[PDB]
Swiss-Prot record:
Binding site for Ca(2+) 1: 57, 59, 61
Sample GO molecular function, one term: metalloendopeptidase activity
Enzyme Commission code: 3.4.24.27
Shown chain mapped onto the complete sequence: 233 to 548 of 548
Descriptive protein name: Thermolysin
Family: Belongs to the peptidase M4 family.
Length: 316
């Protein structure tokens, strides 16, 4: 809507207070005009019809329990936009400042969040397995990254290309978490997963096997479930990414870590310049090696570490 840009205040899912960019026109709307073509957050009102209604508030104060998921979806979408713009010089998910839209309170007791090809959608969780999904910055960044992938490499969501698609979302979801410096770690979804259990997460990049996911190509899932194991086999790539950044010895192969910033530069270049819709793990290795070569030279430590990391997880 057309209005005056202002700043409101509210509390997120985890009870933390934060300022959010809003727009005033009779009501105060969750519309941030400071980032690209704007960030819009909608209320799906427990229904499944999308996008729902643009979030309207009477006083620009968002401290009601019902407001929490909206506050975080709006705020974290902004942080993710900032990461891509400041770190990778990318304007929104399409590279042309496309408006970012999110809907919260989708369905009832919905333990899922997703990118539907046009916008992000967040369930409230059932209160047991998940609390409102937008409360996790790595969750929000994971979802917005699916949009980035769709506009660039276009990795098909099935088998190996799909596992790469998933890993890319986990990798950048984690890098955004570190960017925001919000209790960063190499775990996925820890802030909104199982509120009754502390110390766990949905997936682990540092040790995928902790939750039963493969950490070596020899242990890859070859079945048909989960679109060919896209959320399972992503563990193989997540482990490789973790090793490239942090280093370590995995299955007898030693990797010298080169840091998170270089990891991000290498994978972003691979995603935007070399990967294609049908790329498999072997092609990802080639793309990553070429990207590191472009950026640091064929005889650099960076290229060496990328090769070692993929050797460690069995991807040739
Ligand atoms: Ca209010
Ligand atoms: Ca964390
Ligand atoms: Ca995390
Ligand atoms: Ca938990
Ligand atoms: Zn995903």
């Amino acid at each position: 809507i057309t209005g005056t840009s202002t700043v409101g205040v509210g509390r997120g899912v985890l009870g933390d207070q934060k300022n959010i960019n809003t727009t005033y026109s009779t009501y105060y709307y969750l519309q941030d005009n400071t980032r690209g073509n704007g960030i819009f957050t909608y209320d799906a009102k427990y229904r499944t019809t999308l996008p729902g209604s643009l979030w309207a508030d009477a006083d620009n104060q968002f401290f009601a329990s019902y407001d929490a998921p909206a506050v975080d979806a709006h705020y974290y979408a902004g942080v993710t936009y900032d990461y891509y713009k400041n770190v990778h010089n990318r304007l929104s998910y399409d590279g042309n400042n496309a408006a970012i839209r999110s809907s919260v309170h989708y369905s009832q007791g919905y333990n899922n969040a997703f990118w539907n090809g046009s916008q992000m959608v967040y369930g409230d969780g059932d209160g047991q397995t998940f609390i409102p999904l937008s409360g996790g910055i790595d969750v929000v960044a994971h979802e917005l990254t699916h949009a980035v992938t769709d506009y660039t490499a276009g990795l098909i969501y099935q088998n190996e290309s799909g596992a790469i698609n998933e890993a890319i979302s986990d990798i950048f979801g984690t890098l955004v978490e570190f960017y925001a410096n919000k209790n960063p770690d190499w775990e996925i979804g820890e802030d909104v997963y199982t509120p009754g259990i502390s110390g766990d997460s949905l997936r682990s990049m540092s040790d995928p096997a902790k939750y039963g996911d493969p950490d070596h190509y020899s242990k890859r899932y070859t079945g048909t479930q989960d679109n060919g194991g896209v959320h399972i086999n992503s563990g193989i790539i997540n482990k490789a990414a973790y090793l490239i950044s942090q280093g370590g010895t995995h299955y007898g192969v030693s990797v010298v870590g080169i840091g998170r910033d270089k990891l991000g530069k290498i994978f972003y270049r691979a995603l935007t310049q070399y990967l294609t819709p049908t790329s498999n793990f072997s092609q990802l290795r080639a793309a990553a090696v070429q990207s590191a070569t472009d950026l640091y030279g064929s005889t650099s430590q960076e290229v060496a570490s990328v090769k070692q990391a993929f050797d460690a997880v069995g991807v040739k």
